[PDB]
Amino acid sequence: GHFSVLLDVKHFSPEEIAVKVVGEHVEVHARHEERPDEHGFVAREFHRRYRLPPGVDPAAVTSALSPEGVLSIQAAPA
């Protein structure tokens, strides 16, 4: 099997995103500490969870972040 997801993570830098395989799921945890903006301060955080299909090796799961702010999590077909 394979795994392939694309995510918009526009407010987060690579160091603010944590991807992990926990059980039968791929978890994405993005968090940024308080930062200034036009009107005040803003801190943001999200947690996304996707299931990992049976024929996919958790060790084959890679993650990359594009200069456009698109996070792609993939596991090539086995």
Binding site: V19, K20, V21, V26, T62, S63, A64, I73
Partner: peptide, 9 residues
């Protein structure tokens, strides 16, 4: 639990 490095690209 296995960690997945976020590769800058």
């Amino acid at each position: 639990e296995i960690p997945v490095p976020v590769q800058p690209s």
